[PDB]
Amino acid sequence: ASAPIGSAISRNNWAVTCDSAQSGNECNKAIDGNKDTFWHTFYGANGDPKPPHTYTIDMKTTQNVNGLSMLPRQDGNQNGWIGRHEVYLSSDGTNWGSPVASGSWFADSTTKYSNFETRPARYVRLVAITEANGQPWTSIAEINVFQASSYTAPQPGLGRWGPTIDLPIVPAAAAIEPTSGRVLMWSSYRNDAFGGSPGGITLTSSWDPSTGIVSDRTVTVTKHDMFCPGISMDGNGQIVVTGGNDAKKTSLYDSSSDSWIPGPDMQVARGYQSSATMSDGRVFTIGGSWSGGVFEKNGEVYSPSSKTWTSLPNAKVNPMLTADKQGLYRSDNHAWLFGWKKGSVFQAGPSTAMNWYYTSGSGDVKSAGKRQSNRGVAPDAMCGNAVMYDAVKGKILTFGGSPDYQDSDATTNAHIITLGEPGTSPNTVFASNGLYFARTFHTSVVLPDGSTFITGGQRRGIPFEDSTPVFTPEIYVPEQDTFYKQNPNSIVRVYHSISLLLPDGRVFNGGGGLCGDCTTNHFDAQIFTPNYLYNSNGNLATRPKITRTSTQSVKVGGRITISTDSSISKASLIRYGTATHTVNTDQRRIPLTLTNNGGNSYSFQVPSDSGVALPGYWMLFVMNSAGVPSVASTIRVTQ
């Protein structure tokens, strides 16, 4: 199931209008409080007008609207199930602006929701752009509009949430498809559940920021239910998805061809493991006792060139285990892994003990000391986040999490870890005064300016329960060693939520739940627009444009020359991200040293060390004097 975020508005005095309505299936049948009566567009009768079809509601007075629900006909007939759709709000009834929510609802008879940030409005319009099975009709048994207890305008300067993207699945895992700019998402064998899976199948969905279209695809060719997986983008530009519901499987997603390809089985069956792309484009993984058995699961490594996994039994998981009260089942999960120099992988947590993993020979592991600071030794931080916001300087920001996977209080702990050479114990200090809000199951992304956006989570980890939620995201600004609260959102994003950086410089945050009949499934995402995209007016700022790039594929140590439509102050490369269960081992940021050629022509060198400039796809962002980023230019980095 799912749920509205607001309270149902009384429909007593509502006036409604439809684009068409069969007799017996009048427009007002959608607001009569009877689940057995529904509005239905023209059929047979006045023919079969194809969608879009439109439901417009005049609520007579201004409401602080924060959602709608749509109950499909309940008579066993699928005709008119709304697929693609948009929700508009209005204060006058003629000026509708842009949708507050849009996307696609799953093809079934369950109540569908559009949950979105509160906005005062008197009119609400639902546009059914397509029918879920591609037929001409739209039908609705009951439509409801929901309200918040109050409205508060977003504070100027603190970003903006919206719109909502409605989805057919709970996006518990996600990745950007770097060649197409689409967001790829997946759940499990079902749109809303993983339990009872027979394995072998994954429901996926994608959203295209350029068209606003949400599509779906069932993946069976890889014989892999990809819930609870490792995820890495390898050096050959493919997303390596490992284990989970099918604990020994590897599936490969190729962005260029938009296809899934079977990969080799891993040597050890795993679930909830982290994997990390390495300096040579290979992928390392370790731990993962959520599935495939509970025992010591030491490292192994994937080669995109030979298409094999090779066990690294001496890359021992033991030193990275947390002291989780549930034992090994949890304690080897979700390692904070980062590919680093010379095939090494740094493990920054969640265990108090940090470690170097080495991938030569049959592998090795070396203590990198305890995550700590003058405030003391950091405790285990399961489902804390870790983000490498300046790979050139080896800077990792870690934050949040709890000593145990669940039933454990999260903390505000945050550290800056500074990597040097593999095998040296990195310096660690506390980050500012820590998070504003203690959170676990939160998610995070590094933004083009090197700040880290941190969102969602709850104060006490209770999977599938929307309790103690944190609605106010925070951004860490490294140059200031300061966290800043941003404008809060209205949708709980706890266990099984994701965030990713979009090519346009906005953040895509979604998911949460995946518990079947629970009411805590969130079939959606929202966009967060950082303040760097807004002018002091409150309007979207003019963005510098990259009018020319010398090349779209570059070797590490290689030069790129660009032209812009205006003077550039700073530039960064942000490696494309992948996300699930708080883990994102693919994102990282390289601040770029620009040479000004004059005439708004600039050049820069990609770092020569592929442990820093991990091979794969990266976004190039340029920022003007005002600090406004361009949209990303996609660059492939190779060795």
Catalytically active residues, by annotation: 495
525 contributes a contact to Cu ion by CB under 5 A: no
- d(C-alpha 156, C-alpha 293), whole Å: 51
312 contributes a contact to Cu ion by CB under 5 A: no
Q: What is the dihedral of CA 471, 379, 339, 525, to 10 degrees?
A: -10
Residues with Cβ within 8 Å of 560's Cβ and at least 6 positions away in sequence, in order, are 549, 550, 551, 554, 603, 604, 605, 606, 620, 635
Instruction: Determine whether the annotation assigns residue 496 to a binding site.
Output: yes
Supply the minimum distance, in Å, between the C-beta of residue 198 and Cu ion: 18
Residues with Cβ within 8 Å of 364's Cβ and at least 6 positions away in sequence, in order, are 314, 315, 357, 358
Supply the minimum distance, in Å, between the C-beta of residue 331 and Cu ion: 10
Residues 57-116 within binding reach of Cu ion (CB under 5 A): none
Q: Which is nearer to Cu ion, 575 or 581 (CB)?
A: 581
- d(C-alpha 579, C-alpha 261), whole Å: 20
Supply the minimum distance, in Å, between the C-beta of residue 575 and Cu ion: 22
Supply the minimum distance, in Å, between the C-beta of residue 479 and Cu ion: 30
190 contributes a contact to Cu ion by CB under 5 A: no
DSSP structure string for 402-449: BSSSSSSB----EEEEE--STTSPPEEEE-TT--SS--BS-EEEE-TT
Q: Which is nearer to Cu ion, 408 or 529 (CB)?
A: 408
Nearest to 595 by CA among 555, 547, 559, 552: 559
Supply the minimum distance, in Å, between the C-beta of residue 382 and Cu ion: 5
Which part of the chain contacts Cu ion (CB under 5 A), choosing from 72-80, 137-145, 293-301, 383-391? Answer: 383-391
Q: Which is nearer to Cu ion, 86 or 465 (CB)?
A: 465
Supply the minimum distance, in Å, between the C-beta of residue 232 and Cu ion: 17
- Strand ordering across the sheet containing 553-555: 553-555, 633-638, 616-624, 568-575, 589-591
- d(C-alpha 303, C-alpha 283), whole Å: 7
Which part of the chain contacts Cu ion (CB under 5 A), choosing from 95-103, 155-163, 382-390, 427-435? Answer: 382-390
CB atoms within 10 A of CB 479: 8
Residue tagged 């919206």 (tokens): 162
Alpha helical stretches, state H, 312-403: 328-331
SS3 state at 287? coil
Report cis status (omega within 30 of 0) of the bond before 350.
yes
Which residue in 383, 438, 525, 619 binds Cu ion (CB under 5 A)?
383
381 contributes a contact to Cu ion by CB under 5 A: no
Residue tagged 């567009």 (tokens): 41
Number of residues counted as binding Cu ion (CB under 5 A): 4
Nearest to 111 by CA among 89, 141, 152, 76: 141
- ∠ at Cα 571 (255, 579), nearest 5°? 40
Q: Which is nearer to Cu ion, 422 or 457 (CB)?
A: 457
SS3 state at 328? helix
Instruction: Determine whether the annotation assigns residue 581 to a binding site.
Output: yes
330 contributes a contact to Cu ion by CB under 5 A: no
Which residue in 84, 334, 395, 588 binds Cu ion (CB under 5 A)?
334
- Eight-class DSSP state of 98: S
Residues 562-601 within binding reach of Cu ion (CB under 5 A): 581-582
Supply the minimum distance, in Å, between the C-beta of residue 377 and Cu ion: 20
Q: Which is nearer to Cu ion, 289 or 451 (CB)?
A: 289
Q: Which is nearer to Cu ion, 127 or 167 (CB)?
A: 167
SS3 state at 504? coil
Q: Are 522 and 509 in contact (CB under 8 A)?
A: no
Which part of the chain contacts Cu ion (CB under 5 A), choosing from 236-244, 311-319, 328-336, 593-601? Answer: 328-336
173 contributes a contact to Cu ion by CB under 5 A: no
Nearest to 226 by CA among 274, 186, 263: 186
Two tokens, residue 20: 């068409």
Report cis status (omega within 30 of 0) of the bond before 171.
no
Supply the minimum distance, in Å, between the C-beta of residue 205 and Cu ion: 18
SS3 state at 580? strand
Residues 246-275 within binding reach of Cu ion (CB under 5 A): none
Q: Which is nearer to Cu ion, 65 or 383 (CB)?
A: 383
Instruction: Determine whether the annotation assigns residue 224 to a binding site.
Output: no
Which part of the chain contacts Cu ion (CB under 5 A), choosing from 5-13, 294-302, 365-373, 380-388? Answer: 380-388
Instruction: Determine whether the annotation assigns residue 534 to a binding site.
Output: no
Q: Which is nearer to Cu ion, 79 or 333 (CB)?
A: 333
The half-sphere exposure of 463 on its side-chain side, counting CA atoms within 13 A, is 11
Residues at the contact surface with Cu ion, assessed by CB under 5 A:
334, 383, 581-582
Binding-site residues from annotation? 272, 495-496, 581
